[PDB]
């Protein structure tokens, strides 16, 4: 899957960043962010399989990614406690999404990649 | 002087004038407490956040309305906006400088710790 | 293919970089760059087909990425003339190389992902 | 001050300190004729490249040498340098700042146009 994929890179070693914690939340009618899907980078740097086309609704969704607990497993300290996303889905019908990361101790950057089905 | 933003835009070549930064930080029930906000001066830059007195350590969210920015330009935007949230450590004297470079669709971030 | 692979991604649009020429050259023993392969991004900003185990020996390589006809394409004024990556390869045996980029009209980042066959 | 490079490092957080820039102009012949040069400061910064008289438009590299400021700090680097080539044109008043952010296996760069 499908409509929402994240891809992770490390940007010291040259590699896909593997096991890597994603949590993604969905904003609710009150303002909250509601839990929505998570999941883990494979070896690959990638992580598939968040969610479904009938699931990924219309909304303002924000991609958490735990950069933290990849630089400790590491063994290096890192800066961030996550690279976040925040962004509108979906507002003119539904799109694929592909969250694409590229990590470092004290930067990240982030970048969107959207296309229609 | 203990926390300074830094604002680029990528499309235009230029610093990222007039955008709004709000800091936050993480209170004991896990909820963000606005700390300090500001909007960049014409060199993309904003001082005068915080005092050495009140910057303690923590977890702070720097949040800047890139889509507010990037609407008053007529560009088309991806992000609600950018949060960048980090940990603030005393090791000795430190000045944190939080810089970004925005695009549409793409944002990166660098934190500059240095000793004074 | 297989051992070089270049990827190109657009940060204003959020998208693929269509039809991005890419040229690679190889350091000569008399320290000039000497044409090694050169192609053409896909409808999915990726260019497989650079070369070929036999032929992508150690050495140093540069990439150049044609940013500025991208732009000029697009119909806009860019900064840079091209984006290039300069790189030793191969030096403890084949390795996999992807190279990504990420292009804006004033800055472009450049990645690089290596893998042990 | 009409050319001005920065440069950031991203696995310590700091600017990056001592590291060679080497500028070259595009002569007629396609080859690249040496420009300018220097290290950057404890900043990270390397004012005093050229001047406005010499600063003409044209076809312009600065390349960075990443690999020698990674060896220093022990850290292996893939790059042999970072190379930034870009057209300089004559608009009206301009000064330029090449900024470049490093890691290694990677590196970014914007380019900073302003009007004194
Ligand atoms: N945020 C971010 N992601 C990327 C990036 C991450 C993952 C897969 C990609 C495939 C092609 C191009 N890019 C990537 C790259 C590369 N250079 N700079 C970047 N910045
Ligand atoms: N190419 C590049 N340069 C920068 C960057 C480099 C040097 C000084 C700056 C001052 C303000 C904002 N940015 C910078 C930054 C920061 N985050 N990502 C970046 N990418
Ligand atoms: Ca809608
Ligand atoms: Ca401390
Ligand atoms: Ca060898
Ligand atoms: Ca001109």
Do not use: Q
């Not at 409509?3 to 914690?21: C, E, H, Q, T, W």
């Amino acid at each position: 899957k499908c409509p929402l994929m994240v891809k992770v890179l490390d940007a010291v070693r040259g590699s896909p960043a593997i096991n890597v914690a994603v949590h993604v939340f969905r904003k609710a009618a009150d303002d909250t962010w509601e839990p929505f899907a998570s999941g883990k980078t494979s070896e690959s740097g990638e992580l598939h399989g968040l969610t479904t086309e009938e699931e990924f609704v219309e909304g303002i969704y924000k991609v958490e990614i735990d950069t933290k607990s990849y630089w400790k497993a590491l063994g290096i300290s890192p800066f961030h406690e996550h690279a976040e996303v925040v962004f509108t889905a979906n507002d003119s019908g539904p799109r694929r999404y592909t969250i694409a990361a590229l990590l470092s101790p004290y930067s990240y950057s982030t970048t969107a990649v959207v296309t229609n089905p």
